[PDB]
Symmetry: D2
Subunit: 318 residues, 4 copies
């Protein structure tokens, strides 16, 4: 028997007997993304091109942002869209907190390459007035999360304590359908993805995890150099065919490029529920403690071996 | 002053004062697409998942077929699905042979990695009954070509005499609007793409060109990798932003991969009309003669320069 | 601000500190309706004309149905499309009997006429192995009922205890947005409606009331005879402007021709919760104690003024 | 086989051997009707009511227009929504003049009732610079015409030389599927149609015809009454179910109510062409000589036999 995303959140919701906030949250959440696909595949582009007579990295926010402030179950909402933090209003408050990237893969969409909404639904901790500090928290506290990847199709994977369930998106009616009941990532990939363009800047470490795949020892067989561009786009695929996403340190900074607050943590939290790791290099992406709500971070994620085989190397040159 | 594909391939019709067999290929084909275009976002997935009780790599094949078997401007069509020649019916005879790669990078859709639809439009020469041969012509005689990119959005590219333009699929009115006029790529891009996993079967003419990007000879910023995996998607970015795609020989068979008539042939064309070159290495693509509708070949195309730098590094090992 | 149907259901649900069976309930209906429209508007229509290579009274039903067993809150269901009462299975069963017309207009849909779906939500009172007996209930024992409409656009009105509320269906994302709050109704209207030709069997009041409008005794602006014939559309109209709707008695049966449990029971519970009136002519509809689930009844309704106006005459002929 | 509105006319175009404005004309229109289609089902109603962070007539009029002129097929454009007439710029000219009622059902599109579009097409008559004088022409003079009704579906009924052919919208891909290959109306109909409140301002004739059916002169089945008000919503329903359409003079005045050029003559051409009858009860609708745009008229239409009855009874009260 079937199950719409907007419903299993009702069931589990009952199943736990809380406030209801989280519910509206998800359903708020959900509808926010259905409203971004519409703009994602260029909605009525017809009008803005002259089919009657007489800007995307924005709607995607101007929507979610609103969907939650207005959701009524929020206090402090972060985002790779505002240098400073947004604080819900006295009337529109709720005991939850949200971090997120409204649309990763952004500018790389001119070439219609796949993008998607990423997010972290952490929980507030004190009676102190909510504030940007509320977000400042370690991945693990995460009370739920997941992301929406609008690519070939419009899949939105959800990631709660009860695991992770794949809810495809029949766009013909306007509702998600559960398609991949409670997941878990394969054991060993046979694909490794990391932009290999800045190899010069790659420490020796990385160097060989790429040179022990291309010219593996056990005279096995060479993984793939696949890597699209957007994280949302790769990560996922990696949790399907299995594999490994590498995005480490170099010239720029030791903390690499990628953001911790919203682009990392979330995912790190999905690999870990599907049974995958997520070491930062010296520890776990989900354990690290936040300084600035835009803090940067390095991340390696993928199957158990494609990171234990990894971590193994990384130390050798340490 | 707004315009839709139909109208486009409508207008050019007049200037030419013809017979109506091109404008009805193009049209009748634009339709089969919007369909695959809705069959990919998992149109009505619900219905087949429980909602009321009780395939692409295929559902798509048809759509072009039947839509072409009934255009009447077709004589004999070939596909990445039906082996020998689909020899059109006496009643639906046309003066053009279509060579199409229905759904590209399809088998990698479970992952929602964008995908496209490739297609080359030629014309019969002989007088003799229509068979595989009538479609054994080289992409230099092509009179029409392009493809559709089923990604974050949907864009199709229509190449022919005059030039190249892209149309956007406003999913709210099933129509394709030309978004850019007579587009051309850049001279020397900053991107390279190819499965860098078979680096260990690679042939030198290429093992230099690679070390020739990550570690350029004049301390100038290194380019950037990226290789979505499903061609159509990859090639496209290579267009919009410019750069170089490569899918060379190795040890699979210097036949390499990518299909001639309906994968390489058309892609070279477009490229070649937007100011680029698409070479096999030992000669430009749109020359290489066709023996069997299923002949492969290795192709490197895009921003002319890279293609050139490349074409160069080649000989240094010949 | 901004509201949907699915989150308004949630906000009431919250404020009511309920059990969680209703909110889930109405969420399983909403869904089925949403999946219906796509069919009414001939979704996979051309696919039928083999564009790729190749009965609604039911499907709808089948939907509201199934999705309704699956809402985990039902024990007995009844429709204009299922002879005997349909008893839910042990597991799934839930404290809410529901009745409904899977789609009123079905027949003359060949004119592509405005149609819909009705639904009477009764809470089971007695206590035994769920059987129609409970389905055997009058309109006033209800806690929810109403409808959704198929016409120019898609609207799903929902009236309970709190009030009427209309939710439009955005074809871009698939969700119902609140279009007009606590929908009330004109004390009077200038629009009466009914099957004008059956004046052959018009019991005095009727034929009279008729000529009480066509030619008003007080020289008033003669009413409009807008008869659509297909409940939904008809009814709904009245709510937006006002007037009077009737499907009277005669040689047909001293009891209309519209079943009572799911075609007058709900609709009544709406005309009433909006500020209007409903009647059988002798008595008030909702106050009828239903015998055979498929019993009928004459139904008069619309703005008060007009009803009681008629009603009066009903006595001048008693 | 299959058929799309576009490929129904592109086929017709070939044989025809004409210019191509017509094809471009219709096509451009076809698209114009799709453009509105979405709009009708309140395509973005989610954005206008808040979901982001913050009247239909003119839009539907704006449309058709900016594309008709932009179809390089027009010249003199008449419309129910522009005082006089609009004269295509000198540069975007054509030969065919077009009369269309952008959207009918506008002062009744609150209750959401079925509203559609009707249109006629005359080929320029004067070598004189495009003015209304030009558009002034008899309905017979019509080169083409037809309509599309936004009902349970967005169907299209196109009237041409051939006959009349229908098209139902598949809002998933976006096309007009040929559904009922060329139609004709019944010989006998059993459903009369009209606003019977204007019963006080009816002339004895029109009056008595309602009488012979309200109560047969030969007690065989007593005709059924229907009437949505909306011009298209009915004539159509008439064409599928046999019946008769009346809207003669009354209190307004002995001339009519419905505009000739676009709310009659087209529907007139349609009725006849398919295979029925048309009259003003003063002479064949179309044949009427124009004396100005908004020129109303008395209109009886539908099935021969019934359009025919009315007549013997019309030359009676005379
Ligand atoms: C009908 O849908 C309902 C009913 C109840 C609920 C709770 C207590 C008593 C009663 N009668 C109902 C819910 O509680 C919650 N709590 S929640 O924080 O939103 C939540 C949502 C989910 Cl995805 C998973 C766990 C939790 Cl913790 N959701 C509900 C949804
Ligand atoms: C397939 O697309 C085509 C091909 C030809 C066309 C005309 C002459 C010779 C050849 N080879 C083709 C057309 O001519 C026309 N002429 S037209 O004025 O628009 C037209 C449209 C229609 Cl609805 C019916 C009759 C006529 Cl008259 N449309 C064409 C569309
Ligand atoms: C509806 O608009 C028209 C009118 C005519 C057409 C042709 C001959 C005479 C006249 N009077 C009209 C067309 O011919 C064609 N020929 S065609 O083979 O489809 C074609 C399409 C295109 Cl992209 C470019 C060149 C050619 Cl060759 N299309 C037409 C469209
Ligand atoms: C959105 O998630 C929630 C939370 C709670 C709920 C109820 C009590 C305590 C707490 N903490 C939560 C709900 O109660 C209900 N009750 S209900 O039966 O579904 C309901 C729905 C509606 Cl339209 C109107 C009245 C009622 Cl009676 N729905 C809930 C949904």
């Amino acid at each position: 028997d079937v199950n719409t995303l907007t419903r299993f959140v009702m069931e589990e919701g009952r199943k736990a007997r809380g406030t209801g906030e989280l519910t509206q949250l998800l359903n708020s959440l959900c509808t926010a993304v259905k409203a971004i696909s519409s703009a994602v595949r260029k909605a009525g582009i017809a009008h803005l091109y002259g089919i009657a007579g007489s800007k995307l990295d924005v709607l995607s926010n101007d929507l979610v942002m609103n969907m939650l402030k207005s959701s009524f179950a929020t206090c402090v909402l972060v985002s790779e869209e505002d240098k400073h933090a947004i604080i819900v209003e006295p009337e529109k408050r709720g005991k939850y907190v949200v971090c997120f990237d409204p649309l990763d893969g952004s500018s790389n969409i001119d070439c219609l390459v796949s993008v998607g909404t990423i997010f972290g639904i952490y929980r507030k901790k004190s009676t102190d007035e909510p504030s940007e500090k509320d977000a400042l928290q370690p991945g693990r506290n995460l009370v739920a999360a997941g992301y929406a990847l609008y690519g070939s199709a419009t899949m939105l994977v959800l990631a709660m304590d009860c695991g992770v369930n794949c809810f495809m998106l029949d766009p013909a009616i306007g509702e998600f359908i559960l398609v991949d009941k409670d997941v878990k990532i394969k054991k060993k990939g046979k694909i490794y993805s990391l932009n290999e363009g800045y190899a010069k800047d790659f420490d020796p470490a990385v160097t060989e995890y790429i040179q022990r795949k291309k010219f593996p020892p056990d005279n096995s067989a060479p993984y793939g150099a696949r890597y699209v561009g957007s994280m949302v786009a790769d990560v996922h695929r990696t949790l399907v065919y299995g594999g490994i996403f590498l995005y480490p340190a170099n010239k720029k900074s030791p903390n690499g490029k990628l953001r911790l607050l919203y682009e990392c943590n979330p995912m790190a939290y999905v690999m870990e529920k599907a049974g995958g790791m997520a070491t930062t290099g010296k520890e776990a992406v989900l354990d690290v403690i936040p300084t600035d709500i835009h803090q940067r971070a390095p991340v390696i994620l993928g199957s158990p071996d494609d990171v234990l085989e990894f971590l193994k190397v990384y130390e050798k040159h340490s």
